[PDB]
Design an enzyme around this catalytic site. Structure first.
Site, short mmCIF file in Angstrom:
data_model
loop_
_atom_site.label_atom_id
_atom_site.label_comp_id
_atom_site.label_asym_id
_atom_site.label_seq_id
_atom_site.Cartn_x
_atom_site.Cartn_y
_atom_site.Cartn_z
N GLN A 1 0.79 -1.23 0.00
CA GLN A 1 0.00 0.00 0.00
C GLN A 1 0.82 1.28 0.00
O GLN A 1 1.98 1.30 0.42
CB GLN A 1 -0.89 0.00 1.24
CG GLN A 1 -0.08 -0.30 2.50
CD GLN A 1 -0.89 -0.28 3.77
OE1 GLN A 1 -0.36 -0.56 4.85
NE2 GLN A 1 -2.18 0.05 3.67
N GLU B 1 -8.77 5.59 5.97
CA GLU B 1 -8.62 4.86 7.22
C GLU B 1 -8.31 5.67 8.47
O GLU B 1 -7.69 6.73 8.40
CB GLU B 1 -7.52 3.81 7.03
CG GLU B 1 -7.11 3.05 8.29
CD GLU B 1 -5.93 2.11 8.06
OE1 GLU B 1 -5.54 1.38 9.00
OE2 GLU B 1 -5.39 2.10 6.93
N1 LIG Z 1 -7.41 -2.38 11.17
C1 LIG Z 1 -7.49 -3.83 11.51
C2 LIG Z 1 -7.35 -4.67 10.23
C3 LIG Z 1 -8.50 -4.54 9.26
C4 LIG Z 1 -8.46 -5.16 8.02
C5 LIG Z 1 -9.53 -5.05 7.12
C6 LIG Z 1 -10.65 -4.32 7.48
O1 LIG Z 1 -11.70 -4.21 6.60
C7 LIG Z 1 -10.71 -3.69 8.71
C8 LIG Z 1 -9.64 -3.80 9.60
C9 LIG Z 1 -6.41 -4.23 12.50
O2 LIG Z 1 -5.78 -3.31 13.08
O3 LIG Z 1 -6.20 -5.45 12.69
#
Ligand SMILES: N[C@@H](Cc1ccc(O)cc1)C(=O)O
EC number: 3.4.23.32
Length: 199
Positions: free
Chosen positions: A53, A129
């Site tokens: 990413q 995010e």
């Molecule tokens: N943010 C999450 C991981 C995650 C992956 C995909 C999602 O759709 C949401 C969250 C963690 O800290 O583990």
């Protein structure tokens, strides 16, 4: 309480090659500690072994930064148009590119023989995010307070390729950032655009 930290569109499939889009840099508020990020990537959803990413973050104190990951860094200002892209040439090799378009700056990183984790190339995504900040070994990770932002962050000219062929966002799954049981983003898809408004 952060119940969902990802907002945006997620495509599921196989042999994803390139994922790219252009996103505008919004103004942010809520304090120096508040923040948010917009990025494009491969894997990380159903494929939890690795994630390729790249994108940028905005902070409530008016500052920004750019990064890539499988390292931070380009100067980013409110209103700039940032073209983001990742490419997975294999499950262990690829690249991440970030170009400001407004300033004419561009950064790139090539990866190879990645042992930290391998890609499946089964997930393609455009995400807003509420990221995490960790420290103390890794025993403490917390979501950063989610900054308000405007205007909406829009991923335009979104492009996803699989085995060399284009893949529309027509059937992408949609997610929203959710905090204290309230949607804090309204992300929607249409054509080649993923648009996320702060709520
Ligand atoms: N943010 C999450 C991981 C995650 C992956 C995909 C999602 O759709 C949401 C969250 C963690 O800290 O583990």
């Amino acid at each position: 309480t952060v119940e969902s930290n990802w907002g945006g569109a997620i495509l599921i499939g196989s042999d994803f090659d390139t994922v790219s889009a252009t996103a505008n840099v919004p103004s942010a508020s809520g304090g120096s500690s508040a923040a948010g990020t917009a990025w494009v990537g491969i894997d990380g959803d159903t494929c939890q072994t690795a994630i390729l990413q790249t994108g940028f973050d905005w902070y409530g104190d008016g500052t920004y930064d750019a990064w890539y990951e499988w390292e931070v860094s380009i100067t980013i200002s409110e209103g700039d148009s940032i073209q983001m892209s990742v490419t997975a040439t294999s499950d262990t090799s690829g690249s991440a590119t970030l170009e400001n378009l407004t300033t004419g700056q561009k950064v790139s990183k090539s990866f190879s023989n990645e042992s930290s984790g391998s890609l499946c190339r089964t997930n393609a995504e455009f995400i807003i995010e509420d990221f995490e900040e960790c420290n103390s070994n890794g025993s403490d990770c917390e979501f950063v307070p989610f900054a308000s932002f405007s205007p909406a962050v829009e991923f335009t000219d979104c492009s996803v390729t699989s085995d060399g062929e284009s893949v529309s966002l027509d059937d992408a799954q949609i997610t929203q950032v959710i905090i204290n049981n309230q949607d804090v983003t309204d992300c929607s898809v249409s054509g080649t655009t993923v648009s996320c408004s702060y709520v």
